[PDB]
């Protein structure tokens, strides 16, 4: 009955919000990441890091507001409040982009905390820890995109800024500079996310339309009982229906629900791998066969070459405002443009 | 060709800044999330029916009448993971929720393409922020616009003879 | 000396075969363009 | 097209080795029951 156990006792009490040992890491870090984002989006500028306005205070709306990344000149500085850049000055710290690192790092440690929470509760309750395992997928994405990617580049500046439209810009950057749509690891992620949404919708609909009649009312929700032993819908009729509409169907409820975990988890993991390649500018940018033929044959044209022209438009038209530290000056006459436009 | 189509759409309609597309992403991301959640909750609460040396899947026999997992255990774990009243204990509600979220999200995104077809485009905040003198103060919307512009001026580079690409 | 008691039979059912062949073939279909480059 | 010659062998093995492995385990599974 030492103090350690007394604390364990208290941390693991059944209450409206379970705390647990993982609570000690989760709750401060989750609350700080989230408070930093609301604080910066309400009050803090990106004028000195990006030449952008980015808070409600400056005139931005929910779509355009963001906690932006530090200036390229910070490199990968941890940008600690007490560090050599801001030197304890809260105000300067904000102005130099210190809230980005605050949010990214407290967020990483909250994610760990949350995954430890899934592990802690699963152990206390007596269930298998497959929900913690599935949550590895979000983690991979977050670390690869917000940490590994800009660590392979010149600075945090080129990580995603925390904002709706800042993220849209990140999407478009990756098309023009990395040709990310062409990347087979992104395509595998696409198929996992879309395949996940499909599975989600097809499994819910199927259950709802093979229900057993277990009550008299037109509202069928009332006729389930959390503790009934009986399946509430017919796997058998569900299986014949899909075998006859689609050719194949699930027959194993256990396989089905594992497949539902497997598909979206795997796809997110594949896309994380691809982003690690782009950390290094290791892109699937080109097909060498196409380029050789196109250079020699001015009549040969594909959707592959058309999209590279668009990427070239993107880079030159957005680079100078998007990378202000580079002092890109592109006089009118060097901008790629088609006819009239 | 799919990618071509979606790049040119963005240039001409600013689909990313359109709410119906944002609801599509929410329907698709949320769908993948709830797919993973539901599959991991059922999978976590399967009732021991097998040994270590065999697929747990053999613990369910096609057409058995008893359920193959403990939903009260799944509820009890997920309710504590968040809080009790944000977890489903009614399997009918839960499975209807699975169905409606990505169906509705994707209706909206289909509606997005269908209404942008009539050139009612995404929000335009280009130069919405200016200073006391009237200098433009850029935002992320303006950066997005520099990208859209590069797409605009390069797409179908021999097919425009006049300054506005009106269709 | 005894024969080793830890030996176990291995199984792959027909559905798992179909699933796995589809995976490989579709993986091959996706990456072949990049192998040829 | 001027295409990577080894792409062919790479594709064939990529298909063949994993596929052959599955068939081996399937057929010896059927021969048990």
């Amino acid at each position: 009955r030492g103090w350690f156990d007394i604390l364990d006792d208290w941390l693991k009490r059944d209450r409206f919000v379970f705390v647990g040992w993982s609570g000690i890491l989760l709750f401060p870090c989750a609350y700080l990441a989230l408070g930093g984002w609301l604080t910066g989006t309400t009050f803090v500028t990106s004028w000195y890091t990006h030449g952008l306005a980015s808070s409600y205070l400056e005139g931005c709306n929910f779509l355009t507001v963001a906690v932006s990344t530090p200036a390229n000149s910070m490199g990968h500085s941890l940008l600690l409040l007490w560090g050599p850049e801001a030197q304890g000055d809260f105000t300067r710290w904000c102005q130099l982009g210190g809230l980005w690192t605050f949010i990214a790092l407290h967020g990483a440690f909250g994610l760990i905390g949350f995954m430890l929470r899934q592990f802690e509760i699963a152990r206390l309750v007596g269930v298998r820890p497959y929900n913690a395992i599935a949550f590895s997928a979000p983690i991979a994405v977050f670390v690869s995109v917000f940490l590994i990617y800009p660590l392979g580049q010149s600075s945090w500046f080129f990580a995603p800024s925390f904002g709706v439209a800042a993220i849209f810009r990140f999407l478009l950057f990756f098309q023009g500079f990395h040709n990310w749509t062409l990347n087979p690891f992104h395509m595998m992620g696409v198929a996992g996310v879309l395949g996940g949404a499909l599975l989600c919708a097809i499994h819910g609909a199927t259950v709802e339309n093979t229900l057993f009649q277990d009550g008299e009312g037109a509202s069928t929700f009332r006729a389930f009982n959390p503790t009934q032993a009986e399946e509430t819908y017919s796997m058998v009729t569900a299986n014949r229906f899909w075998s006859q509409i689609f050719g194949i169907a699930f027959s194993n409820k256990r396989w089905l629900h594992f497949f539902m975990l497997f598909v979206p988890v795997t796809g997110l993991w594949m896309s994380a791998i691809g982003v690690v390649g782009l950390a290094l500018n290791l892109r699937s940018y080109d097909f060498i066969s196409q380029e050789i033929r196109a250079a020699e044959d001015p009549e040969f044209e594909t959707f592959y070459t058309k999209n590279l022209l668009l990427n070239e438009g993107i880079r030159a038209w957005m680079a100078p405002q998007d990378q202000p530290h580079e002092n890109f000056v592109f006089p009118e006459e060097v901008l790629p443009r088609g006819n009239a436009l | 060709g799919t990618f071509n189509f979606m790049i040119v759409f963005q240039a001409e309609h600013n689909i990313l800044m359109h709410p119906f597309h944002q609801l599509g992403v929410a329907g698709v991301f949320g769908g993948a999330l709830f797919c993973a959640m539901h599959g991991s909750l059922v999978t976590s609460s399967l009732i021991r029916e097998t040994t270590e040396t065999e697929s747990a899947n053999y613990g369910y026999k096609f057409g058995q009448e008893e359920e193959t997992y403990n939903i009260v255990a799944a509820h009890g774990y997920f309710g504590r993971l968040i809080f009790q009243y944000a977890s489903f204990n009614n399997s009918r509600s839960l499975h209807f929720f699975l169905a409606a979220w990505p169906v509705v999200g994707v209706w909206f995104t289909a509606l997005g393409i269908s209404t942008m077809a009539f050139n009612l485009n995404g929000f335009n905040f280009n130069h919405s922020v200016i200073d006391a003198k009237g200098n433009v103060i850029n935002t992320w919307a303006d950066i997005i616009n520099r990208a859209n512009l590069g797409m605009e001026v390069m797409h179908e580079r021999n097919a425009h003879n006049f300054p506005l690409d009106l269709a | 000396m005894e024969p080793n008691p830890n030996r176990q039979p291995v199984e792959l059912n027909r559905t798992s075969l179909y699933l796995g062949l589809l995976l490989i073939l579709v993986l091959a279909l996706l990456f072949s363009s990049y192998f040829f480059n | 097209m001027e295409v990577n010659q080894l792409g062919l062998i790479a594709t064939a093995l990529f298909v063949l080795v994993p596929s052959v492995f599955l068939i081996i385990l399937y057929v010896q599974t059927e021969s048990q029951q």
Binding site: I248 | - | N13, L25, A28, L29, F36 | M1, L8
Partner: peptide, 30 residues
């Protein structure tokens, strides 16, 4: 040779479809 490879793989998938549907493990009740 690339054309033949692409089409060969696509043809194997279609064959696989055929067997997965008409030559499936037939699901049996309980």
């Amino acid at each position: 040779m690339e054309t033949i490879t692409y089409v060969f793989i696509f043809a194997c998938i279609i064959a696989l479809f055929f067997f997965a549907i008409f030559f499936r493990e037939p699901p049996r009740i309980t």
